[PDB]
């Protein structure tokens, strides 16, 4: 079986620029083709016999390589090609997939819009508290929430998930929720949830005094 | 039109065995070999069957579980996996060969392999407040919490309201069930005349529910 390593892993470029993205196979192939994937959907054809642009590509794409070597190329880079990219061989059994190569936007650095919500009233009726935090529409991804419950840091009661970048603005958002039984939540005043992104020069607390609508 | 419209979500015990649909619509089935395609979590090419002849090929690696069929009479191709581990929970596509390469892919088959019963989402409202408002506009979402397996899927006003809303990809917790969230922004002087449902669908459990979401002083 003919791996594909593709390389980088990861990349960002933004408007107009150009990229290049890098697909080895580990023995001689005769085209290797491309597929893009973005989040939600499943992939589509790209390019096959390692230059020909499928139906709806724009032309700035386009590929090159012969041997074990290829390459994709965008000229100019625009919004829509942020995706997943997995190059692909039909040239021996069994066919086989790249490992991909994720292409984001790169943008300039925004700060999170950052909003906390506390246990519904229904919620609190059967016994449980999820407290939500949420950091909307911010730039880069990497980012950091502690949870503090008067002032205690909080450790193993939270969990977090991340959104892939906007279509509009090319932001993430993300959110947090720690959940705690009603018996342990009624124990407490302060609920805050401290953000920590370059986007900000010092860390965000945002909090709520239990009980206040 | 053309569209591979691939059976829903499985949720199949360990060791016993789950078969998966792929019905070719709006073009002529026979004219087109189908693949699969396994998407563990990166795509990994499970094999072909002619949807003419029937003959198959498959990935080493899948022989002993993989298993293809076709029945021509409803256009629909299957495949069988068997002998369920873990390492078989993964997104399944079927993809329709063309001319130059995969053309046309169904939306693909989520299958969640585990003993464990079906498990229908609670949702909780994210009510909008000033804890939630920034610049005249306001956050709101709904919480899906402790539902088996994925997906779930989330719309706000039967689909009316799309511009604004992030819906999160679930979290695995503790106690082994999935919770997300879906939230919208929208104009603070939209509170108070124009409501906001939220509606999910958990497909594993039956599960249908709507839920408005009401602001607060």
């Known amino acids: 079986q003919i791996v594909l390593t593709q390389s980088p892993a990861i990349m960002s470029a933004s408007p107009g620029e150009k990229v290049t993205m890098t697909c080895s196979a580990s023995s001689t192939i005769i085209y290797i083709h491309w597929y893009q994937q973005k989040p939600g959907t499943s992939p589509k054809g790209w390019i096959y016999?390692?230059?020909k642009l499928a139906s709806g590509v724009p032309a700035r794409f386009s590929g090159s390589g012969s041997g074990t070597s290829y390459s994709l190329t965008i000229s100019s880079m625009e919004a829509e090609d942020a995706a997943t990219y997995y190059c692909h061989q039909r040239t021996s059994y069994p066919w086989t997939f790249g490992g991909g190569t994720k292409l984001e936007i790169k943008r300039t650095v925004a700060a999170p819009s950052v909003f906390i919500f506390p246990p519904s009233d229904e919620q609190l009726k059967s016994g449980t508290a999820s407290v939500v935090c949420l950091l909307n529409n911010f730039y880069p991804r990497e980012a950091k929430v502690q949870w503090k419950v008067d002032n205690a840091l909080q450790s193993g009661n939270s969990q977090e998930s991340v959104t892939e970048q906007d279509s509009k603005d090319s932001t993430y958002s993300l959110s947090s929720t720690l959940t705690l039984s009603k018996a342990d939540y009624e124990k407490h005043k302060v609920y805050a949830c401290e953000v920590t992104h370059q986007g900000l020069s010092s860390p965000v607390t945002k909090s709520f005094n239990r009980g206040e609508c | 039109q053309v569209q591979l419209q691939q059976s829903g979500p499985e949720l199949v015990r360990p060791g016993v065995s789950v078969k998966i649909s792929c019905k070719g619509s709006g073009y002529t089935f026979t004219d087109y070999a189908m693949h699969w395609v396994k998407q563990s979590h990166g795509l990994e090419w499970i094999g072909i069957i002619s949807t003419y002849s029937g003959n198959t090929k498959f990935h080493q690696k899948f022989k002993g579980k993989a298993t293809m069929t076709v029945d021509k009479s409803s256009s629909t191709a299957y495949m069988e996996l068997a002998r369920l581990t873990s390492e078989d929970s993964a997104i399944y596509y079927c993809?329709?060969?063309?001319?130059?390469?995969?053309?046309?892919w169904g939306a693909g088959t989520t299958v969640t392999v585990s003993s464990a019963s079906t498990k229908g989402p609670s949702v909780f409202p994210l009510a909008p407040s000033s804890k939630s408002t920034s610049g005249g506009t306001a956050a709101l979402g709904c919480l899906v919490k402790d539902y088996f397996p994925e997906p779930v899927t989330v719309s706000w006003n039967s689909g009316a309201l799309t511009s604004g809303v992030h819906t999160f990809p679930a979290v695995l917790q503790s106690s082994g069930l999935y919770s997300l969230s879906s939230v919208v922004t929208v104009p603070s002087s939209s509170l108070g005349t124009q409501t906001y449902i939220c509606n999910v669908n958990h497909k594993p459990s039956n599960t249908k529910v709507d839920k408005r979401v009401e602001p607060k002083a």
């Open positions: 016999d390692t230059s």
């Open positions: 993809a329709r060969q063309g001319t130059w390469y995969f053309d046309v």
